[PDB]
Design a protein around this ligand. Structure first.
Ligand SMILES: C[S@@+](CC[C@H](N)C(=O)[O-])C[C@H]1O[C@@H](n2cnc3c(N)ncnc32)[C@H](O)[C@@H]1O
Length: 263
């Protein structure tokens, strides 16, 4: 595990979280408790989820100075977050769980999150349409949340010293911006098209038609018909997957759903 040892970046994350004594924070991973202490100072309460019992001495040391720290000993991927009552998430995330844990937190919901990722992963999270780093991850995150990189974090900020950079990412869920029609369908649609990101949306939808529960022939015929409901839809399915904006992919999947169910 790479522990955050540079207090300038702890200060930064804490600051980025815009904490008041009315916020309850969820922290993923205890570490040395350096981030934990700053959270307890500035928030009403902090839940820490830690899988390793060998770090208890830090927990018991902190519990002796602060009465507003509750430690949940377990695996952050397994804990039912619906049973906890918190509005914010601030953590130096264990880089192996970065993807599933993002989508679990976003699913559960929160006012704001401030999270440490590996730099390359953060780049994909914030990437603009039409770039090399734009992919399923970009769309899956942005369609649900406003994301930005707050700071680039050097290997020197951690101990032991990593091979690569990390990044502080600020996440602000915005459900009303894009309005997804059916979450399960939208997920299948993204998986399908980003399996062929440099093809047209329509050629992508055909090659991986399995994902939307069709064979290649039904889908080919489905797309010919869908095409004929308006010219906007014609221009979108003929464009390369990685060139559609999040707004276009959400808008396109919403209509392809309504087309399919009314069929
Ligand atoms: C990157 S360190 C960050 C800890 C601390 N915030 C720091 O930077 O000083 C990862 C921490 O999360 C814990 N951890 C790793 N995997 C976990 C998991 N699946 N669930 C809960 N905790 C985990 C590790 O024991 C370790 O304490």
């Amino acid at each position: 595990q790479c522990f955050l040892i540079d207090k300038n970046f702890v200060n930064k994350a804490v600051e980025s979280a815009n904490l008041t004594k009315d916020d309850v924070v969820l922290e993923i991973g205890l570490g040395k408790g350096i981030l934990t202490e700053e959270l307890a100072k500035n928030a009403k309460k902090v839940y820490v989820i830690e899988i390793d019992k060998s770090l208890e001495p830090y927990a018991n040391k902190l519990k002796e100075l602060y009465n507003n720290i509750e430690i949940i000993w377990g695996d952050a991927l397994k804990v039912d977050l619906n049973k906890l009552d918190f509005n914010k998430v601030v953590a130096n995330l264990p880089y192996q769980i970065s993807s599933p844990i993002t989508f679990k937190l976003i699913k559960r919901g929160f006012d704001l999150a401030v999270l440490m990722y590996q730099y390359e992963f953060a780049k994909r999270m914030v990437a603009a349409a039409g770039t090399k780093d734009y992919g399923r991850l970009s769309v899956a995150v942005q369609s649900r949340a406003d994301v930005e990189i707050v700071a680039k974090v050097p290997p020197s900020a951690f101990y032991p010293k990593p091979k690569v950079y990390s990044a502080i990412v600020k996440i602000k869920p915005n459900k009303g911006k894009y309005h997804i029609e059916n979450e399960n369908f939208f997920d299948d649609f993204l998986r399908a098209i980003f399996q062929h990101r440099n093809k047209s949306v329509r050629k992508a939808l055909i090659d991986s038609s399995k994902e939307l529960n069709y064979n290649k022939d039904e889908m080919k015929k489905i797309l010919e018909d869908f095409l004929n409901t308006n010219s906007e839809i014609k221009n979108l399915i003929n464009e390369k997957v990685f060139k559609l904006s999040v707004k276009d992919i959400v808008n396109l999947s919403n209509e392809f759903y309504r087309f399919l169910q009314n069929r």
